[PDB]
CSV table of C-alpha atoms and ligand atoms in Angstrom, one decimal:
chain,number,residue,atom,x,y,z
A,18,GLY,CA,93.4,112.4,135.8
A,19,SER,CA,95.7,109.7,135.8
A,20,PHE,CA,97.8,110.5,132.6
A,21,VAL,CA,98.9,114.0,133.0
A,22,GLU,CA,101.8,113.5,131.0
A,23,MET,CA,99.8,113.1,127.4
A,24,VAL,CA,97.0,116.0,129.0
A,25,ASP,CA,97.4,118.9,126.3
A,26,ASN,CA,99.8,117.1,124.1
A,27,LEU,CA,97.5,118.3,120.9
A,28,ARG,CA,97.7,121.5,118.6
A,29,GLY,CA,95.8,122.6,115.9
A,30,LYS,CA,92.2,123.2,114.7
A,31,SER,CA,89.5,122.1,113.1
A,32,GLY,CA,90.2,122.9,109.1
A,33,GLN,CA,93.7,122.1,109.5
A,34,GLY,CA,93.5,119.1,111.9
A,35,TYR,CA,94.9,118.2,115.4
A,36,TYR,CA,99.0,116.9,115.7
A,37,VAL,CA,100.8,115.9,118.5
A,38,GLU,CA,104.9,115.8,118.6
A,39,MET,CA,106.3,112.7,117.4
A,40,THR,CA,110.2,111.4,117.0
A,41,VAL,CA,111.5,109.3,113.9
A,42,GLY,CA,114.9,108.0,113.6
A,43,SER,CA,118.4,107.9,115.5
A,44,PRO,CA,119.3,110.5,116.9
A,45,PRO,CA,115.5,111.2,117.1
A,46,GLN,CA,113.9,113.7,114.5
A,47,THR,CA,111.1,115.7,115.9
A,48,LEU,CA,108.2,116.2,113.5
A,49,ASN,CA,104.6,117.3,114.0
A,50,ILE,CA,102.1,114.6,113.0
A,51,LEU,CA,98.6,114.9,111.7
A,52,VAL,CA,96.3,112.6,114.1
A,53,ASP,CA,94.0,110.6,111.9
A,54,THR,CA,91.8,108.0,112.9
A,55,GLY,CA,90.1,107.7,108.9
A,56,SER,CA,93.5,106.1,108.1
A,57,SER,CA,96.2,103.8,108.8
A,58,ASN,CA,99.0,104.9,107.6
A,59,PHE,CA,102.0,106.5,109.3
A,60,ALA,CA,103.3,108.8,106.8
A,61,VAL,CA,106.0,111.5,106.8
A,62,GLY,CA,107.2,114.4,104.4
A,63,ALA,CA,110.7,113.1,103.6
A,64,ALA,CA,111.7,115.6,101.0
A,65,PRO,CA,111.7,119.3,100.5
A,66,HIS,CA,108.2,120.9,100.2
A,67,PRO,CA,106.7,124.4,100.2
A,68,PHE,CA,104.6,123.9,103.3
A,69,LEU,CA,107.2,122.0,105.2
A,70,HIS,CA,109.7,123.6,107.2
A,71,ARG,CA,111.0,120.2,108.2
A,72,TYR,CA,111.4,116.5,106.9
A,73,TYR,CA,112.1,112.9,107.8
A,74,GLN,CA,116.1,112.5,106.6
A,75,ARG,CA,116.5,108.7,106.3
A,76,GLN,CA,119.8,109.4,105.7
A,77,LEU,CA,120.5,110.8,109.0
A,78,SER,CA,119.0,107.9,110.9
A,79,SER,CA,121.1,104.9,112.2
A,80,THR,CA,118.2,102.9,112.7
A,81,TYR,CA,116.4,103.2,109.1
A,82,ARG,CA,115.8,100.3,107.3
A,83,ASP,CA,114.5,100.2,103.8
A,84,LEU,CA,111.7,98.2,103.0
A,85,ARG,CA,112.4,98.6,99.1
A,86,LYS,CA,108.6,98.9,98.5
A,87,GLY,CA,106.4,102.1,97.4
A,88,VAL,CA,103.4,102.7,98.2
A,89,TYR,CA,100.8,105.2,96.5
A,90,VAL,CA,97.7,107.0,98.4
A,91,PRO,CA,95.3,108.9,96.0
A,96,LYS,CA,97.7,112.0,97.0
A,97,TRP,CA,101.1,111.6,98.3
A,98,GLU,CA,103.5,108.9,96.8
A,99,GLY,CA,106.6,107.3,99.2
A,100,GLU,CA,109.0,104.9,100.0
A,101,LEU,CA,108.4,102.6,102.8
A,102,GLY,CA,110.9,101.7,105.7
A,103,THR,CA,110.6,101.3,109.3
A,104,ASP,CA,112.4,103.0,111.8
A,105,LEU,CA,112.5,103.6,116.0
A,106,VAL,CA,109.7,106.1,116.9
A,107,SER,CA,108.4,107.4,119.9
A,108,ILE,CA,105.8,110.2,121.5
A,109,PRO,CA,107.4,112.4,123.6
A,110,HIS,CA,104.3,113.5,125.5
A,111,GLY,CA,102.9,110.2,125.2
A,112,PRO,CA,103.9,106.7,126.9
A,113,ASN,CA,107.3,106.6,127.5
A,114,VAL,CA,108.4,103.7,125.0
A,115,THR,CA,110.1,103.5,122.0
A,116,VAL,CA,108.7,101.2,119.2
A,117,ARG,CA,109.8,100.0,115.9
A,118,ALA,CA,107.0,100.5,113.0
A,119,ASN,CA,106.3,100.8,109.3
A,120,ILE,CA,106.9,104.5,108.1
A,121,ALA,CA,106.4,105.6,104.5
A,122,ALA,CA,108.5,108.5,103.8
A,123,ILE,CA,106.6,110.9,101.7
A,124,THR,CA,108.6,112.2,98.3
A,125,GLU,CA,105.9,113.4,96.1
A,126,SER,CA,102.4,114.9,97.1
A,127,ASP,CA,99.8,116.9,95.3
A,128,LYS,CA,97.4,118.9,97.6
A,129,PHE,CA,98.5,116.8,100.7
A,130,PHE,CA,100.4,119.2,103.0
A,131,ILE,CA,98.5,122.1,104.1
A,132,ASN,CA,100.2,125.6,104.1
A,133,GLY,CA,100.2,126.8,107.7
A,134,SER,CA,99.2,123.9,109.3
A,135,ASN,CA,102.7,123.3,111.5
A,136,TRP,CA,102.5,119.2,110.7
A,137,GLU,CA,104.7,117.1,108.7
A,138,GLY,CA,103.1,113.9,109.0
A,139,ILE,CA,100.3,111.8,109.3
A,140,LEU,CA,99.4,109.5,112.0
A,141,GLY,CA,96.6,106.6,110.8
A,142,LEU,CA,95.2,105.2,113.9
A,143,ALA,CA,92.9,103.2,112.1
A,144,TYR,CA,92.9,99.8,111.5
A,145,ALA,CA,95.0,97.5,108.8
A,146,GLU,CA,92.6,96.7,106.8
A,147,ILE,CA,92.6,100.0,105.3
A,148,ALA,CA,96.4,100.6,105.4
A,149,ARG,CA,98.0,100.9,101.7
A,150,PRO,CA,99.7,99.4,100.0
A,151,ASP,CA,97.7,96.5,102.1
A,152,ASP,CA,96.6,95.1,105.2
A,153,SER,CA,100.0,93.7,105.5
A,154,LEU,CA,101.7,97.1,106.8
A,155,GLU,CA,101.2,96.8,110.4
A,156,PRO,CA,99.6,100.2,111.6
A,157,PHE,CA,101.6,102.1,114.2
A,158,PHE,CA,99.4,101.4,116.7
A,159,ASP,CA,99.4,97.7,116.2
A,160,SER,CA,103.1,97.8,116.2
A,161,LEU,CA,102.8,100.3,120.0
A,162,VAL,CA,100.3,97.4,121.6
A,163,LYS,CA,102.5,94.7,120.2
A,164,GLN,CA,105.8,95.6,121.2
A,165,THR,CA,104.8,97.5,124.8
A,166,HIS,CA,102.6,97.0,127.6
A,167,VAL,CA,100.6,99.7,126.3
A,168,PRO,CA,96.5,99.0,126.6
A,169,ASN,CA,95.0,98.4,123.0
A,170,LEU,CA,93.1,101.6,123.6
A,171,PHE,CA,93.6,105.3,123.1
A,172,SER,CA,91.0,108.6,123.6
A,173,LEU,CA,90.8,111.8,122.0
A,174,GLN,CA,89.8,115.4,123.3
A,175,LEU,CA,89.8,117.9,120.5
A,176,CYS,CA,89.6,121.2,121.7
A,177,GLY,CA,88.3,123.8,119.5
A,178,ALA,CA,88.7,127.5,120.7
A,179,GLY,CA,85.3,128.7,119.7
A,180,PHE,CA,86.7,131.7,117.9
A,181,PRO,CA,89.7,132.3,115.2
A,182,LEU,CA,93.2,131.5,116.0
A,183,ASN,CA,95.8,133.5,114.4
A,184,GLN,CA,99.3,131.9,112.8
A,185,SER,CA,101.1,132.9,116.2
A,186,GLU,CA,97.9,132.0,118.4
A,187,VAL,CA,97.7,128.4,116.6
A,188,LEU,CA,101.0,127.5,117.8
A,189,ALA,CA,100.9,128.6,121.3
A,190,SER,CA,97.7,127.3,122.4
A,191,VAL,CA,96.7,123.8,123.3
A,192,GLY,CA,94.4,121.6,121.1
A,193,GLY,CA,93.8,118.9,123.0
A,194,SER,CA,94.7,115.7,124.3
A,195,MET,CA,95.6,112.1,123.1
A,196,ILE,CA,96.0,109.9,125.7
A,197,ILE,CA,97.9,106.6,124.5
A,198,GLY,CA,96.4,103.5,126.4
A,199,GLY,CA,93.9,105.4,128.5
A,200,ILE,CA,91.2,107.2,129.7
A,201,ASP,CA,91.9,110.3,131.6
A,202,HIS,CA,88.7,111.3,133.6
A,203,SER,CA,89.6,115.1,133.8
A,204,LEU,CA,88.7,115.3,129.9
A,205,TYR,CA,85.2,115.1,130.2
A,206,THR,CA,82.0,115.4,132.5
A,207,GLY,CA,79.1,113.3,133.3
A,208,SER,CA,79.3,109.9,132.0
A,209,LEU,CA,80.8,107.8,129.2
A,210,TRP,CA,78.6,105.9,126.7
A,211,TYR,CA,79.7,103.3,124.3
A,212,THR,CA,78.6,102.1,120.6
A,213,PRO,CA,79.7,99.0,119.0
A,214,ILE,CA,82.7,99.5,116.6
A,215,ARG,CA,80.6,97.8,113.8
A,216,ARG,CA,83.6,96.4,111.9
A,217,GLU,CA,87.3,96.7,112.7
A,218,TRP,CA,88.6,98.7,109.2
A,219,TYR,CA,87.7,102.5,109.7
A,220,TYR,CA,86.3,103.5,113.2
A,221,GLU,CA,82.6,101.9,112.1
A,222,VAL,CA,79.7,102.7,114.1
A,223,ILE,CA,75.5,103.1,113.5
A,224,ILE,CA,73.2,105.6,114.0
A,225,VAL,CA,69.7,104.7,114.5
A,226,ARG,CA,68.5,108.2,115.0
A,227,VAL,CA,68.5,111.8,114.4
A,228,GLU,CA,66.9,114.6,115.5
A,229,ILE,CA,67.2,118.5,115.3
A,230,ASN,CA,65.9,120.2,118.1
A,231,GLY,CA,64.4,116.9,119.4
A,232,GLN,CA,62.5,116.8,116.1
A,233,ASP,CA,62.9,113.3,114.7
A,234,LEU,CA,64.3,113.5,111.0
A,235,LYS,CA,62.3,110.5,110.7
A,236,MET,CA,64.1,109.2,107.5
A,237,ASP,CA,64.7,105.0,107.4
A,238,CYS,CA,67.5,104.4,109.4
A,239,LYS,CA,69.7,103.0,106.8
A,240,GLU,CA,69.8,106.1,104.9
A,241,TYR,CA,72.2,107.7,107.7
A,242,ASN,CA,74.8,104.9,107.5
A,243,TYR,CA,74.7,104.8,103.8
A,244,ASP,CA,77.0,103.5,103.3
A,245,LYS,CA,78.6,103.9,106.6
A,246,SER,CA,79.4,106.1,109.1
A,247,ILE,CA,82.9,106.4,110.8
A,248,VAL,CA,84.5,108.5,113.2
A,249,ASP,CA,87.4,110.4,111.4
A,250,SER,CA,89.6,113.3,113.3
A,251,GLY,CA,91.2,113.8,110.3
A,252,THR,CA,87.9,115.2,108.3
A,253,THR,CA,86.7,119.0,109.7
A,254,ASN,CA,83.0,118.9,109.2
A,255,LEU,CA,80.2,116.4,109.9
A,256,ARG,CA,79.4,114.9,106.7
A,257,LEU,CA,76.2,113.4,105.8
A,258,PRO,CA,74.9,111.1,103.1
A,259,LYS,CA,73.5,113.3,100.0
A,260,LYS,CA,69.8,112.5,101.2
A,261,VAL,CA,70.4,112.6,104.8
A,262,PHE,CA,72.1,115.9,104.1
A,263,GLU,CA,69.1,117.9,101.8
A,264,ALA,CA,66.7,116.6,105.2
A,265,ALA,CA,68.8,118.1,107.8
A,266,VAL,CA,69.9,121.2,105.9
A,267,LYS,CA,65.8,121.6,105.7
A,268,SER,CA,65.0,121.1,109.3
A,269,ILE,CA,68.1,123.3,110.1
A,270,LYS,CA,67.0,126.0,107.9
A,271,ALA,CA,63.4,126.0,109.1
A,272,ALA,CA,64.6,125.9,112.7
A,273,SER,CA,66.6,128.9,112.4
A,274,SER,CA,63.9,130.3,110.0
A,275,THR,CA,63.9,133.6,111.8
A,276,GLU,CA,67.3,134.2,109.8
A,277,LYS,CA,67.6,134.0,106.5
A,278,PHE,CA,70.8,132.6,105.3
A,279,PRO,CA,72.3,132.3,101.5
A,280,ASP,CA,72.9,129.5,99.7
A,281,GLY,CA,76.5,129.5,99.9
A,282,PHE,CA,76.4,129.3,103.5
A,283,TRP,CA,74.6,126.4,103.2
A,284,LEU,CA,76.9,125.0,101.0
A,285,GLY,CA,79.7,125.2,103.3
A,286,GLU,CA,81.4,127.3,101.3
A,287,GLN,CA,80.7,131.2,102.5
A,288,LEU,CA,81.3,132.7,106.1
A,289,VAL,CA,78.4,134.4,107.3
A,290,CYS,CA,79.1,137.7,110.3
A,291,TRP,CA,77.7,139.2,113.1
A,292,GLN,CA,79.1,142.1,115.3
A,293,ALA,CA,81.2,141.0,118.0
A,294,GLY,CA,79.5,138.9,120.7
A,295,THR,CA,76.2,139.0,119.0
A,296,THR,CA,75.9,135.6,117.4
A,297,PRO,CA,72.6,134.5,117.4
A,298,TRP,CA,73.2,130.8,118.9
A,299,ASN,CA,69.9,130.7,120.1
A,300,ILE,CA,68.1,130.5,116.8
A,301,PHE,CA,70.1,127.6,115.6
A,302,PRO,CA,68.6,123.9,116.7
A,303,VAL,CA,70.9,121.5,118.8
A,304,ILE,CA,71.6,118.4,116.5
A,305,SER,CA,71.5,115.0,118.3
A,306,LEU,CA,73.0,111.9,116.7
A,307,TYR,CA,71.5,108.4,118.4
A,308,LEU,CA,74.3,105.5,118.2
A,309,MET,CA,73.7,101.8,118.6
A,310,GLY,CA,74.2,100.8,122.5
A,311,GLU,CA,75.8,97.8,123.6
A,312,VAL,CA,73.0,96.6,125.2
A,313,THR,CA,70.1,94.7,122.5
A,314,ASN,CA,67.4,97.4,121.6
A,315,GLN,CA,69.4,100.3,123.7
A,316,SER,CA,71.0,103.4,122.3
A,317,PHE,CA,72.5,106.6,123.8
A,318,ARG,CA,72.5,110.1,121.8
A,319,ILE,CA,75.0,112.5,121.8
A,320,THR,CA,73.7,115.8,121.7
A,321,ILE,CA,76.0,119.1,119.4
A,322,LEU,CA,75.2,122.7,119.5
A,323,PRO,CA,75.6,125.4,116.6
A,324,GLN,CA,79.1,126.0,118.4
A,325,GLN,CA,80.4,122.5,116.9
A,326,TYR,CA,78.5,122.5,113.8
A,327,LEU,CA,79.3,126.6,112.8
A,328,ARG,CA,83.4,126.8,112.3
A,329,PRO,CA,84.8,129.9,113.6
A,330,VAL,CA,86.5,131.8,110.6
A,331,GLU,CA,88.8,135.1,110.3
A,332,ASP,CA,86.5,137.7,108.5
A,333,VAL,CA,88.0,138.2,104.7
A,334,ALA,CA,88.4,141.9,106.3
A,335,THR,CA,90.0,140.5,109.6
A,336,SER,CA,87.6,143.2,111.3
A,337,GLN,CA,86.0,142.5,114.6
A,338,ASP,CA,82.5,140.4,113.9
A,339,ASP,CA,82.6,136.7,114.6
A,340,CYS,CA,82.4,134.8,111.4
A,341,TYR,CA,82.0,131.2,111.3
A,342,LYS,CA,81.4,128.8,107.6
A,343,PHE,CA,79.0,126.0,108.1
A,344,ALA,CA,80.5,122.9,109.0
A,345,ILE,CA,78.0,120.0,107.9
A,346,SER,CA,78.5,118.9,104.1
A,347,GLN,CA,77.2,116.3,102.3
A,348,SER,CA,78.7,112.8,101.5
A,349,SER,CA,79.0,110.3,98.8
A,350,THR,CA,81.0,108.1,101.2
A,351,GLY,CA,78.9,107.5,104.2
A,352,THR,CA,78.2,109.7,107.0
A,353,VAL,CA,81.6,111.3,108.8
A,354,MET,CA,81.8,112.4,112.3
A,355,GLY,CA,84.8,114.6,111.7
A,356,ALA,CA,86.6,117.4,113.9
A,357,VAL,CA,83.8,119.7,114.5
A,358,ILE,CA,81.5,116.9,115.9
A,359,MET,CA,84.5,115.4,117.9
A,360,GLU,CA,85.6,118.5,119.6
A,361,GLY,CA,81.9,118.4,121.9
A,362,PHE,CA,83.3,115.3,123.1
A,363,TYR,CA,86.0,113.1,124.9
A,364,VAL,CA,86.2,110.1,122.4
A,365,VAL,CA,87.5,106.9,123.4
A,366,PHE,CA,88.6,104.3,121.0
A,367,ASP,CA,88.4,101.2,122.7
A,368,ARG,CA,90.3,98.8,120.5
A,369,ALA,CA,90.3,96.2,123.3
A,370,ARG,CA,86.8,95.8,123.8
A,371,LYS,CA,85.8,96.9,120.2
A,372,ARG,CA,83.8,99.7,121.4
A,373,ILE,CA,83.9,103.5,121.1
A,374,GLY,CA,83.0,105.9,124.0
A,375,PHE,CA,81.8,109.3,124.2
A,376,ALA,CA,81.3,111.6,126.8
A,377,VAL,CA,80.7,115.6,126.9
A,378,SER,CA,84.2,117.1,126.6
A,379,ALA,CA,85.5,119.3,129.3
A,380,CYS,CA,86.4,121.5,126.5
A,381,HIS,CA,83.5,121.8,124.5
A,382,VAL,CA,82.4,125.6,123.5
A,383,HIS,CA,78.7,126.6,125.0
A,384,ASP,CA,76.9,129.1,126.0
A,385,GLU,CA,75.2,130.0,129.0
A,386,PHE,CA,71.6,128.5,128.2
A,387,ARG,CA,72.9,124.9,126.3
A,388,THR,CA,75.5,122.6,126.7
A,389,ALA,CA,76.7,119.7,124.5
A,390,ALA,CA,74.9,116.0,126.0
A,391,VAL,CA,75.8,112.7,126.2
A,392,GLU,CA,72.4,110.8,127.3
A,393,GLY,CA,70.5,107.4,127.7
A,394,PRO,CA,69.6,104.8,127.4
A,395,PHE,CA,67.0,104.8,125.3
A,396,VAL,CA,64.8,101.8,124.0
A,397,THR,CA,65.4,101.3,120.1
A,398,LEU,CA,64.5,98.7,117.7
A,399,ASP,CA,65.7,96.7,115.1
A,400,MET,CA,69.4,99.2,115.1
A,401,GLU,CA,70.7,96.0,113.6
A,402,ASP,CA,68.4,96.8,110.5
A,403,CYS,CA,70.2,100.2,110.5
A,404,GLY,CA,73.5,99.0,109.2
A,405,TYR,CA,74.2,99.3,105.3
A,406,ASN,CA,75.3,95.8,103.5
A,407,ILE,CA,76.5,96.4,99.7
B,1,BDV,C1,93.6,117.7,107.7
B,1,BDV,C2,92.0,118.4,107.3
B,1,BDV,C3,91.8,118.8,105.9
B,1,BDV,C4,90.9,119.9,105.3
B,1,BDV,N1,89.8,118.9,106.2
B,1,BDV,C5,88.8,118.2,105.2
B,1,BDV,O1,87.8,117.9,106.1
B,1,BDV,N2,89.2,118.1,104.2
B,1,BDV,C6,88.3,117.0,103.6
B,1,BDV,C7,88.8,115.9,103.9
B,1,BDV,C8,88.2,114.5,103.1
B,1,BDV,C9,88.4,113.3,103.2
B,1,BDV,C10,89.6,112.7,104.5
B,1,BDV,C11,89.3,111.4,104.6
B,1,BDV,N3,90.9,111.1,104.6
B,1,BDV,C12,91.3,110.9,106.2
B,1,BDV,N4,91.0,110.8,107.2
B,1,BDV,N5,92.5,110.9,105.8
B,1,BDV,C13,93.2,111.1,104.4
B,1,BDV,C14,94.0,109.4,103.9
B,1,BDV,C15,94.2,112.0,104.4
B,1,BDV,C16,93.8,113.4,104.9
B,1,BDV,C17,93.8,113.5,106.2
B,1,BDV,C18,94.2,114.4,104.0
B,1,BDV,C19,92.1,111.4,103.9
B,1,BDV,O2,91.8,111.2,102.7
B,1,BDV,C20,90.2,114.1,104.9
B,1,BDV,C21,89.6,115.4,104.4
């Protein structure tokens, strides 16, 4: 591991998000910021809010610059400006970046998440108000010698973290500008970034316990497939969700679960330590490789797709919610999927790499996997075109 200063710089969990500490302004104002690969704005609470115990105070920053422009994101509303920004446990550089000062929000801030802002790591094409508002990471690369690449190791604990535990627990690593080899095992496999807006990829095959879901592969990427640390669940296009759940139910049929469970609404609980991991199937997603007609697969365990939640009775049972849900906006590889892997966002080579995470939760019989190569034909046809 060559980036020790950035290792273990994240805190949080799949349900409320993973955040990194940042400073804004002069003198520096410390804030916890949500790491979000599904958006492109750097936005921070800038006014009192029931869920914020701190916020950005523009009038206290000598380096604050007002852009005299508003921003609306449906929801949070803010005022645009720029100021000096740093990441304490990151590259030792300070950059001037766009900052949306959030003055009004509805259902944005999560009570107890411990984060006061969001760091949108995706491309300018999806930045608000428009693509002229340069994203933080673009500013970082243009102003310093930091390589145009970042990598994420999101670490789920595999069990419920209480309010004090989640504050004292290491939730992972965001390595800015590099790849740290201590964060993964095995090999890194790269899939093309299809287009630079969201981190868009193409899924070419889906298996549940080795059984091909057998759908037209365009179904898997309807209308797009993205990697999004700001989303908790693995989200799947309606028809793919329906087929995947049918197959997961069939594989786990030795136990009957209520419809509320499959809807991701209700928790299921087992006596402490008796969770029947083995009756649940592994899920494999085949991703387009960098070599023509070649793919690789990432395989996740139920330890990833069943999200630990504290029993409504705080009892000693191990409880979980089904963390796979339907989408009307395409496939979303959210935090529960990212928890199984070390994910490399190689902006410079327009590719995303996957490797088994050194912190993924597993059991003595099965482990998450990243394997390849596999011969796969017509993968360009798996992409969706409006
Ligand atoms: C931080 C986790 C919140 C709870 N877990 C979810 O799964 N909640 C649903 C959900 C649906 C879609 C998105 C996509 N998404 C983002 N990735 N970023 C924004 C622009 C803002 C987000 C971060 C609030 C957004 O709407 C994000 C979250």
